[model samples]
Target: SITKTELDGILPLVARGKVRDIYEVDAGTLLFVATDRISAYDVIMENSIPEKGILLTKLSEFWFKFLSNDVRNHLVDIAPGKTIFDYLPAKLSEPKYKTQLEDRSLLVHKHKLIPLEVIVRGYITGSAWKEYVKTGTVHGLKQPQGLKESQEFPEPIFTPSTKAEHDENISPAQAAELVGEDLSRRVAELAVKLYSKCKDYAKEKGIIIADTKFEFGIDEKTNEIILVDEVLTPDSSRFWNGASYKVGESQDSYDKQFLRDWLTANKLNGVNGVKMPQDIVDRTRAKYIEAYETLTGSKWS
Candidate 1:
């Protein structure tokens, strides 16, 4: 219904983002909709897993509500009819299964986003390890003279980056200089706040929010900084198995990292830059489902 009424009228698509299609709904609003598309290793793969869009939207809603006091996010409502802005009146329809999907779409405020990916890590891995091994420092934070991989840091570190285009890494001072001293500090403050809260909650769920990146935006009218983007998901954050928790090793997760492991096991980590095989795709899909169910403690679908 939304596609028929609203989305069908876009004169020309404004921008096609990695996981979303952006259309100019009006001068001030955007109809940002998620598709089933998934990306990995900085590559946008061809296949789509069904209901993935709604799954992300739903998951974003959950995190937004959980941390609304910490930051603002662009989540308005979930309307099954097309446009992102469309919100079917609750009084108009009986509450049932449709309501669940409706809640998936969010009515959100548009913002001139601050263009910073505020990341804090409870443990060291990934880029941190890469940077440490290469330069003996991470984002300019010098490490102990000798630390092994996957080791816990003395404390959670606030390593901000110049939120580059499509996952490019940036230096911390560059990010601070671009965003300004006060604003950059504020970003770090919020990053640690969110990371702490989320980490504690995740531990209760028997998972670790090991490390994650968050995006924030400035509300032009209110001059308020708010958080945006999906939070603590396997895509933006690292989830580690709790049972095997250790200080110096990457742990298994219900998340899609399993896909990468599977790829390596099948000698398919890199196959002339082609995407994973169909069977691997299905198994990866299952891993995502397992993640969703495990993290939320609720059956998906």
Candidate 2:
């Protein structure tokens, strides 16, 4: 049940994100330590799946390399003698603490982060589908009518939600107002491109990269936008089993589908710190392995 971790009173802790524990390495760089923790429907469970953190790190690294040409990225690729361990305080290199960080940390430079949830939707589903059922629009942007649940859009659309604000969804225009017209337009185009390429790649592996949230950081000096957070990880994107996908029904997501379906069926979604039943835990853990195996075409040995 020990799913959470705080660094051993050494590295300066920044904040505990839903899955990652952030720390400061220096004035200019930040260390993001991914934990085995997992969350669904906006609540963290009591237990974490073993090796989930390592799998997440590996997926992001693979995707970062895949999408490197489309935009600036943040993973500090470790070369020989330049591993993430070497950038840490000496004591953390000890076995006691090293095990906590091995295969789970990403080191990157800091930049001015845009606080919007930069989302691109290739398929009509989730909140977008909810809104469409009622108002024929998503994020207040007009969507073509008669779109079925889990149906792919004629093209992907940029829909954003408030990240640190009131948790309300927003339109593309609203997103532009917060960041800027030029940057918003620029980011939207790049996000769709990134999603499109990855969608094709994942589709080839029998996984559907339905939609994803992309977070960006900007260099004010050059006005260059960097894709700062993990991209195309199960935690960040909605992955559907392509073989089981249906155009007219809600799709099965690869990562949290089991937990989310169970929580709602048991009427415990949005209830925090609930301990998942063993069946829920095992099934959920299976996808973590399943996704890594399918996406990378290798076993999670």
Candidate 3:
């Protein structure tokens, strides 16, 4: 079985992402394969963490099931077998395709992706923390004075941004301009609700769901807003250990932020030819596995 896939000879390749490879199965469906690759500071690392992709896929599957009633999603099936072969007109499915489909891929409905990164924040942190400290606002919304770094907000807020090579934070007004006012408002409402539900569940698991971003797309069949892309994985959300969370300082996390902080500490940003140490990679992989076990209450394989 392939641990990390490049899909070099796989025909009908639709798109390749930092973590997932996309393939066009047919007009109705797409195949997504999560890889063991990790990216930090907009730079994909050279190392591959074994089993990381499966853990990520598992986490996304968990959240998709948990939040299905709250929103419509693009997920169709995790195991496709000949079902996948039946969709594509191309001669792509075979023994090689079956290998990747075992634990690290998804079969999902194809939707026209909306161009907004729908973000929701329950805590003051990351770029929002930097913005709050400098300008006392987040995405053009004013915040209470003297809020410390990582402090929880009374209510989660929607902060949308552009989906670009380098994403720029935008106000709700700017988002509305791109996707229309009604759809933009609907995204914000759904984002907050999703975050709240996730945060509540994580709290009981001794983890904190600080903030997360969601991607949405319009379902071509029903014309409904549906959750697309990965949901609430450590790659998309801030997962903090609840026991160590404190408002006044940055808390240690169980997400990609850990690697980001390590890279920053080592001054690796924009520095060419620097590779992550094996320990850092192993620890990061362990963190992701721990998050999966904690949130799902199932032991990681």
Candidate 4:
């Protein structure tokens, strides 16, 4: 029930993202701990969703395994003894620290990450929809005329973005310029493939994967591209319940869009130093849990 915002006695913190805490495990491995923290509009929320970290880790693990045949990833192990921790200093392996390393943590191989948010969109929506409405393009790539807000694309599109304080949408050609044509094309092909597989699977579960973002890294030793970071989790993707989806309207989703709506409605849409209400936090937690259970077809513990 405790919400972990920080971890002590874990030396050499590598990176602290909006939710995940990355720690240097050794020269070749890293410790990724998913915290229960939630973010809306690029700002961390005051309230943490109960068990959100576990849901993220479990869902990521599920997708990683499901898509393993189609791709290589940085995932080394989920938890419990599949790490170098047991061989580290004895105090680090003490039972007291094990609780912090439960289902919410992952022990992964470190890689030279490619600096691009390799996003694939199966539907025209979100920033893409808005852009199309004004500019007749998605990531500067022209789209067919008269597409509705939530309409599906004949083929899912790979739109990569640069990682910044605000992710700027870029064309695949621009992305190729940033990270070479070969690697850019490789990730794009893989991104669309990964999205297609997940979209098909989620549809069977009555969930529609509108779009998702992927991060890739080059394995230092193998010199191969591998999927890194989280994949297809609610935080990284937009999941719409297929049964209630409407083409012309904004569809209800299972992701953090609900919390985003609450923030926008309450005039806390940005970093305004406002705290969220308990009801809003509770509903957001329920939506995250629902997405996990619905897609995985397994009860969220």
The numbered model that scores best in lDDT is: 4
lDDT (Cα, tens digit) per residue for candidate 4, span 224-245: 8898899888898899999999
* lDDT of each residue in 1-301, candidate 3, tens digit only: 2435544455467777878877876667788778777788666777767767778788888999999899898888635455554543344456556556556777788889889989999998998998889999999889999999999988998988899867889999999999989988988998899899989999999998888889999765686789889888888888889999988999887888888888898888655444679899889888888888898989997
Using lDDT as the yardstick, the better of models 1 and 4 is 4
lDDT for 154 in candidate 2 is: 88
Which is better, 1 or 3, measured by lDDT? 3
Q: Per-residue CA lDDT of candidate 1, range 17-130, in tens?
A: 556655554565554555656665544556665566566666666678788777767765445666432343333134442332343344455667787777888777878888
Q: Is candidate 1 or candidate 2 better by TM-score?
A: 2
TM-score of every candidate relative to the true structure: 0.80, 0.95, 0.92, 0.93
Root mean square deviation (Cα) for candidate 3: 2.5
lDDT score, candidate 1, position 91: 30
As for TM-score, the candidate ahead, 2 or 3, is 2
**What's model 2's overall lDDT?**
0.83
What is the TM-score (0 to 1) of candidate 4? Answer: 0.93
lDDT of 4: 0.84
Alpha-carbon runs more than 4 Å astray in model 1:
1-6, 10-12, 77-85, 88-105, 260-273
Error of 2 at 214 (Å): 1.2
Ranking by lDDT: 4, 2, 3, 1
Give lDDT tens digits, candidate 2, residues 54-77: 888888888888888888887666
What lDDT does the true structure give each of the candidates? Answer: 0.64, 0.83, 0.82, 0.84
